[PDB]
RNA sequence: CGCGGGGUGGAGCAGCCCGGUAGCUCGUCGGGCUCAUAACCCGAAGGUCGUCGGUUCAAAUCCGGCCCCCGCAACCA
RNA sequence: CCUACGGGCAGGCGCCGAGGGUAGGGCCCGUGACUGGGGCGAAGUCGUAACAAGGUAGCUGUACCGGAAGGUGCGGCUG
RNA sequence: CACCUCGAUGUCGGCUCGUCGCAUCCUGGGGCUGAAGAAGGUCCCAAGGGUUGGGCUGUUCGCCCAUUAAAGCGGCACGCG
RNA sequence: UGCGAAUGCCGGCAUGAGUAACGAUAAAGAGGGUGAGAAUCCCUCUCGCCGUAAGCCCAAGGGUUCCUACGCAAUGGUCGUCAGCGUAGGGUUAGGCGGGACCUAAGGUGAAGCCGAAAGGCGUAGCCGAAGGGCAGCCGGUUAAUAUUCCGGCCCUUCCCGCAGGUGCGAUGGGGGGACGCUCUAGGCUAGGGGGACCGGAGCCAUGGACGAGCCCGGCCAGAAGCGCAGGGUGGGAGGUAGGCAAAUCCGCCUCCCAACAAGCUCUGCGUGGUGGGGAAGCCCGUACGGGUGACAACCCCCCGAAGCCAGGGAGCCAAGAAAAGCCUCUAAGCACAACCUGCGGGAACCCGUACCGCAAACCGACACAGGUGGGCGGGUGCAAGAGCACUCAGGCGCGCGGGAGAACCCUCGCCAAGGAACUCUGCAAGUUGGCCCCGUAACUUCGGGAGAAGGGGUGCUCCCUGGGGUGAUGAGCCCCGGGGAGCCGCAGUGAACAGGCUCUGGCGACUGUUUACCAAAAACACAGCUCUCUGCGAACUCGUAAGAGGAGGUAUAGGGAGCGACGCUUGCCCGGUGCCGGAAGGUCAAGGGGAGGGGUGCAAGCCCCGAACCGAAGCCCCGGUGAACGGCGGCCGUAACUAUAACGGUCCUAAGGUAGCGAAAUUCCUUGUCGGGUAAGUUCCGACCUGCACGAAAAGCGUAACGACCGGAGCGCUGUCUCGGCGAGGGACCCGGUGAAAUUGAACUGGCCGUGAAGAUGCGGCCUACCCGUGGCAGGACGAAAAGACCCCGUGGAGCUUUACUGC
RNA sequence: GGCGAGCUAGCCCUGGCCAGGGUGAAGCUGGGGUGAGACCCAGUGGAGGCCCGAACCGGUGGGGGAUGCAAACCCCUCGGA
RNA sequence: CGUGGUUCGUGGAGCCAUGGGGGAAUCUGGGCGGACCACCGCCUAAGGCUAAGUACUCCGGGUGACCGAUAGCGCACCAGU
């Protein structure tokens, strides 16, 4: 549960590494169903469009299965739980009896031997995916679809969960990781349980270099700039914002709400 | 120290070459120019 | 030297703009309640308005000289 | 050099060695701009905390706050 | 004050090397003294030569330590890049 | 259409001037040859210099610079008979080496498709795209000049055809595979290297000795099958099947049965191998290079041993480590008198490159330029190791002006009596220290550190005794770690070379890191970490007119913006103003709706203009919240039984009047504040007071071990820093021969003083002084050169930057 | 309206390089310890924007150079490794 | 309603063109003569073709009170070298 280090070098002092005991006998993460060449590049055609990115360990993509209705009724055995450098979560490799293999984002407490299944049928046990509507009010769940058949998009980060607070008409009321209250169509497949590797929140990179392996380049405060290139920049020995704090592009960054108002999605939301 | 000219046969054709000049419309113009003027060489060698 | 504000009963302030009225709190004095003191209640006194002129019928008020007190400024060199 | 020489003495070298020097530690004492609380001291200032439901029962361990005594929160004791 | 210099007259102090003035800090010669002697005060003559080493500060300056016959003041583009 | 000026334009020729310089201080000397001519070209001998190179191979780039004959006008910083230069002729040989008739990567391009006023942009498949993947040649000889290319020896691949044998053959499709990190690392080998009394070899005995197990020299290279030694790879059989976008007998999954071993099968590496070939010193030849001999050369044992090979080996770890083809297997249409597989045999095997330079005189730097340039090899001895340092092999060089002289002065070095920071802005500089082994080592601390703390001792050689390991047989040898003892020598034993000065104490920043390419390396940026805020996913945000793309093939333990900056203890009060957030009411307001009413022209119908009320958004007003949002955080007067002082009070004002802590501070004006400390003496330094001109809590507050080419103070050590200089060395400076610049320049026959003058006179006045002309030196003057002053102002001149300046997008 | 990332900055794909020394984290094994533990001690092991130090990357102080060898150089010293 | 064109810069602003909205008629129908109405006249939109007179000079010729090698084209010459 998060390994510590003795201070035999500074930065090693408060540094902290993940615990890999949930990683079933695993290394080369089996080709076929993933990997897949991951085109890692920090911008688009030409220009940088997201700042302070680059470098970082080269990594094979693990093509995971984010829609499970693909295999209604066909159960599967949990073969392994392995490392995926593409998400905070860990991925379980599950063999189907169909003979087909695919990865799923590993729920918490999912043991390496369980039979798993998806469908209106499906016993309500950790690992099984079901259309929301057929899931008992109050059960936690993850990897939720937002619209039927469009693939799971909610609660996929390590530790993230989602409760089903109720039902109404064709929809069910979910409380999301954000704390938002969302009507979601009952036909949307979720999968019981909460993501997992939840100690993930408490790791401590420790050093500058560590943030770089993850491919995060240094981040420079506007403050440290000249007026040419950022709203806060210049005036001798620095100086308070001197205006309502803003992003390099001019817009205010403290409090100013940015969600588009007329979003049709609006009439299905109800919280923070 | 290290100066600005580091010759590279491939770079020079890939950049100022004839086939390169001919794609961009601005490039065709360069050629159209050097011809009008009568340049013995429309392109680096 | 520059610039701006200020000086009014014992203390701290208002009244100066917009001319003629001097006002508030505390303190002070006399009287009550108290064994007594404070608090509390009833009454009262006290200011020429920093000085010298000027304007005006009339100046704390408008004007100028000075006397003070406070603040700011003094940069390129 | 002396003999009563396969010796003695002188002399030479070496160990140890008082102490002297250089270096770094420890324990104790005295002293120091300034500084903390404490005791004592016929008639100083401020308030009223306690003793009588002390005029908000008191005390208590902890915690935050306050010119000061103290106040408040949490739990405990009844003395 | 704005006269030469803004098609450039490098701007403090230090170091080096000096040279001049005397309105003299010391030594030489004096008058007066409230000059007994010794030592001083004060003014006159005198520019020959001499006028220390340190601590503080970029400092010039100034303070201080230790001396000394004395620890002189100025000018030379606040002498001299 | 008339020139003397424009720091004018083009050109020519002067001055400085025979002046500076002739490009690393690695270094030269003589003899002989050639030639009109020789320090400079050829040869010999002697000397010196590189040797993880200044030697050798490869890739870029360069493009005749390559070899030979002839040649010296110019290029060569001198010379030139020489040359990389002029003329001419020669020279680059591949089925196996590199690249192409193979594969894919980023990226590019791009049928379909999408978007854009035109130009064009995006874009699935596909295609292009390599130092990555695939793939068959090793060694010797020969040329003046090429060679894995010619030859020689041994060996190999693909394609076509045929013969035989074998099988359902068949792919752009399916599957297996190719296939992948970092650090450490096992065994066995190889390159490589040292030794040998053994094997082979011309000769050598010098100068006192040595005819000797003497000295000197060499004792290998490539190589099929087969065989050995090491290692990698891999389960076999059967049955069920709904998955691997058709089908598979293949793969996947399930049950069962046998091996779990590498046994078997298979691949690679190493060894041995037929055969092929090389083969020193020395001496003889003649070079401008090489050649004959040595030779019928010999060709063997021992040891040290990789970072390389067996290779996909093993272990640990987190940051979790390309693709496609070749390849194998499976089947599909299709064909099965096909086709494919194995073996043999004959035939066929194309294009381009190949000279030379390649750490540099041939590449990038206008230059035969002290700079820059990727990969491999890089021997020996010694020093603890090593690619370090010294010397040296192979090889290559003395860097294309020289000769003398022995001044000042400069550069680079060496030493110095006594003193030892007195130097100075500062110990700047330089010195001291210095490797290994052992003894020993503080406060403090985050328990790791601080630590190489500090401070010490040992270090050579000779002989004797003696322990352990690797390889061998347990043995000798050889190689490696040592242990004890007695002695010898010097001023000195890491005897030369490479090799920390130390301590105390503050400031800033936690730390390693990053930065103004070329005046700033820092206390600045970044950094892990804290907080705020935005974003429910066609997310926010960014780029784009768009399509689209990044975000992300991510999903709130996630992503964007902002501030702060390890860690420790903490981060107070003010929401009045500005921002942001919430607020279905009300106030206001645009287009639009709406039309009461007015008007223009018509004989009229009508036609056509205006236009009230009223219903019409966001925004603003208004109403609340919000401080790790922009921000802010009082004044006067009095008061205690000495005095002062003020816990206490009075009053004015404010949105509220700065809490903890810190404080003459990177902040303190007054100021060298005052007191203490250090010093003989302290404007700085440390401690302290608070009178904070003008600290204060995430533009964070106060501390903090460790860390720092940061910045301040003190001491020890040691010194040419200094008192205060002296001597010495080498490279210049000087002289001689050769070559030969530059800024600058109105013209010159160019003195001092005191004056004057546009106010600082060689040039005017008066006087003074002074024969003509050079050379080595010094810098006071020519308001000396250089740059049309960067400061300052001026121009209704420019430009970057800002905002509650104006007006737009 | 065009030309430039053959210099320099960032990123992307694919290769390469970092002599030799030292310090000794986890884990492991053994011994101790307990009711079982924690934990302790050895030995082993070999972690780290760890240490010394060439290559390689740097540009700290100083001296020289200033019509330079050089339109950023040379020497000594120094940082990372 | 928003714009362009015309001398027309919102002006009394027509005419011609048209991005947006609404949206006819076919001879007694339509457009125009500078807001609008009347009167009076002019012309037949929403399809198209059409020589010549006009513009230019790479090129050829003829002329010159044009140049004469620092002129004249950048080039009198193996120069867009
Ligand atoms: Mg930052
Ligand atoms: Mg800045
Ligand atoms: Mg910019
Ligand atoms: Mg801005
Ligand atoms: Mg700002
Ligand atoms: Mg500031
Ligand atoms: Mg150039
Ligand atoms: Mg060129
Ligand atoms: Mg290339
Ligand atoms: Mg075209
Ligand atoms: Mg031609
Ligand atoms: Mg008063
Ligand atoms: Mg009263
Ligand atoms: Mg009374
Ligand atoms: Mg009066
Ligand atoms: Mg200014
Ligand atoms: Mg005391
Ligand atoms: Mg006391
Ligand atoms: Mg009480
Ligand atoms: Mg009481
Ligand atoms: Mg009580
Ligand atoms: Mg109070
Ligand atoms: Mg309590
Ligand atoms: Mg209680
Ligand atoms: Mg003037
Ligand atoms: Mg005047
Ligand atoms: Mg001049
Ligand atoms: Mg006199
Ligand atoms: Mg000083
Ligand atoms: Mg003087
Ligand atoms: Mg003056
Ligand atoms: Mg001066
Ligand atoms: Mg100077
Ligand atoms: Mg002339
Ligand atoms: Mg003239
Ligand atoms: Mg000529
Ligand atoms: Mg001269
Ligand atoms: Mg000379
Ligand atoms: Mg000379
Ligand atoms: Mg060479
Ligand atoms: Mg040639
Ligand atoms: Mg010749
Ligand atoms: Mg010649
Ligand atoms: Mg010559
Ligand atoms: Mg030359
Ligand atoms: Mg040649
Ligand atoms: Mg030639
Ligand atoms: Mg080759
Ligand atoms: Mg073909
Ligand atoms: Mg291809
Ligand atoms: Mg394109
Ligand atoms: Mg290709
Ligand atoms: Mg290849
Ligand atoms: Mg090949
Ligand atoms: Mg060969
Ligand atoms: Mg050759
Ligand atoms: Mg060998
Ligand atoms: Mg050998
Ligand atoms: Mg013989
Ligand atoms: Mg002899
Ligand atoms: Mg013999
Ligand atoms: Mg040998
Ligand atoms: Mg099996
Ligand atoms: Mg072999
Ligand atoms: Mg073999
Ligand atoms: Mg033979
Ligand atoms: Mg030779
Ligand atoms: Mg492995
Ligand atoms: Mg293909
Ligand atoms: Mg088959
Ligand atoms: Mg060749
Ligand atoms: Mg060659
Ligand atoms: Mg060469
Ligand atoms: Mg070569
Ligand atoms: Mg090289
Ligand atoms: Mg060159
Ligand atoms: Mg040369
Ligand atoms: Mg060179
Ligand atoms: Mg470089
Ligand atoms: Mg030795
Ligand atoms: Mg060594
Ligand atoms: Mg070396
Ligand atoms: Mg040598
Ligand atoms: Mg040699
Ligand atoms: Mg030379
Ligand atoms: Mg000395
Ligand atoms: Mg001495
Ligand atoms: Mg001493
Ligand atoms: Mg001093
Ligand atoms: Mg001094
Ligand atoms: Mg120094
Ligand atoms: Mg040294
Ligand atoms: Mg320390
Ligand atoms: Mg010896
Ligand atoms: Mg042995
Ligand atoms: Mg050292
Ligand atoms: Mg060091
Ligand atoms: Mg730092
Ligand atoms: Mg740099
Ligand atoms: Mg710089
Ligand atoms: Mg997207
Ligand atoms: Mg993506
Ligand atoms: Mg900061
Ligand atoms: Mg705060
Ligand atoms: Mg507020
Ligand atoms: Mg408010
Ligand atoms: Mg507000
Ligand atoms: Mg408001
Ligand atoms: Mg008393
Ligand atoms: Mg301050
Ligand atoms: Mg003292
Ligand atoms: Mg200072
Ligand atoms: Mg303050
Ligand atoms: Mg501050
Ligand atoms: Mg703040
Ligand atoms: Mg800070
Ligand atoms: Mg501090
Ligand atoms: Mg650093
Ligand atoms: Mg530093
Ligand atoms: Mg000296
Ligand atoms: Mg003369
Ligand atoms: Mg004069
Ligand atoms: Mg005259
Ligand atoms: Mg004269
Ligand atoms: Mg002279
Ligand atoms: Mg001079
Ligand atoms: Mg000179
Ligand atoms: Mg000048
Ligand atoms: Mg000017
Ligand atoms: Mg202007
Ligand atoms: Mg580049
Ligand atoms: Mg390190
Ligand atoms: Mg370090
Ligand atoms: Mg290091
Ligand atoms: Mg290397
Ligand atoms: Mg330097
Ligand atoms: Mg620098
Ligand atoms: Mg330097
Ligand atoms: Mg320098
Ligand atoms: Mg060093
Ligand atoms: Mg270094
Ligand atoms: Mg107008
Ligand atoms: Mg329309
Ligand atoms: Mg009509
Ligand atoms: Mg008309
Ligand atoms: Mg009309
Ligand atoms: Mg008409
Ligand atoms: Mg019509
Ligand atoms: Mg018509
Ligand atoms: Mg026409
Ligand atoms: Mg013509
Ligand atoms: Mg003529
Ligand atoms: Mg001519
Ligand atoms: Mg001409
Ligand atoms: Mg022409
Ligand atoms: Mg011309
Ligand atoms: Mg021509």
From Swiss-Prot, chain A:
InterPro entries: NA-bd_OB-fold, Rib_uL2_dom2, Ribosomal_uL2, Ribosomal_uL2_bac/org-type, Ribosomal_uL2_C, Ribosomal_uL2_CS, Ribosomal_uL2_dom3, Ribosomal_uL2_RNA-bd_dom
Region described as Disordered: 222-272
Residue spans of biased composition, Basic residues class: 256-272
Listed GO CC annotations: large ribosomal subunit
Keywords, ordered alphabetically: Ribonucleoprotein, Ribosomal protein, RNA-binding, rRNA-binding
Gene3D superfamilies: 2.30.30.30, Nucleic acid-binding proteins, Ribosomal protein L2, domain 3
GO MF term list: rRNA binding; structural constituent of ribosome; transferase activity
Function: One of the primary rRNA binding proteins. Required for association of the 30S and 50S subunits to form the 70S ribosome, for tRNA binding and peptide bond formation. It has been suggested to have peptidyltransferase activity; this is somewhat controversial. Makes several contacts with the 16S rRNA (forming bridge B7b) in the 70S ribosome.
Subunit record text: Part of the 50S ribosomal subunit. Forms a bridge to the 30S subunit in the 70S ribosome, contacting the 16S rRNA. May also make transient contacts with protein S6 during translation in the 70S ribosome.
UniProt protein name: Large ribosomal subunit protein uL2
Species per Swiss-Prot/TrEMBL record: Thermus thermophilus (strain ATCC 27634 / DSM 579 / HB8)
Lineage, opening ranks: Bacteria, Thermotogati, Deinococcota, Deinococci, Thermales
UniProtKB/Swiss-Prot annotation, chain B:
GO biological processes: translation
Xref: Gene3D superfamilies: 1.10.287.3980
Compositionally biased intervals (Basic residues): 29-45
Annotated stretches, region: Disordered: 26-45
This protein's GO CC annotations: ribonucleoprotein complex; ribosome
Pfam families tied to this protein: Ribosomal_L34
Stored InterPro entries: Ribosomal_bL34 (IPR000271), Ribosomal_bL34_CS (IPR020939)
GO MF annotation list: structural constituent of ribosome
Protein origin, superkingdom: Bacteria
Key word Cell membrane present: no
Keywords: Ribonucleoprotein, Ribosomal protein
Function recorded in the entry: Found on the solvent side of the large subunit.
Similarity section: Belongs to the bacterial ribosomal protein bL34 family.
Note: The open reading frame (ORF) for this protein is entirely within the ORF for the RNase P protein (RnaP). The two start codons are separated by four nucleotides.
Oligomer and partners: Part of the 50S ribosomal subunit.
Protein name: Large ribosomal subunit protein bL34
Naturally occurring in which organism (per UniProt): Thermus thermophilus (strain ATCC 27634 / DSM 579 / HB8)
Lineage, broadest ranks: Bacteria, Thermotogati, Deinococcota, Deinococci, Thermales
Gene (name only): rpmH
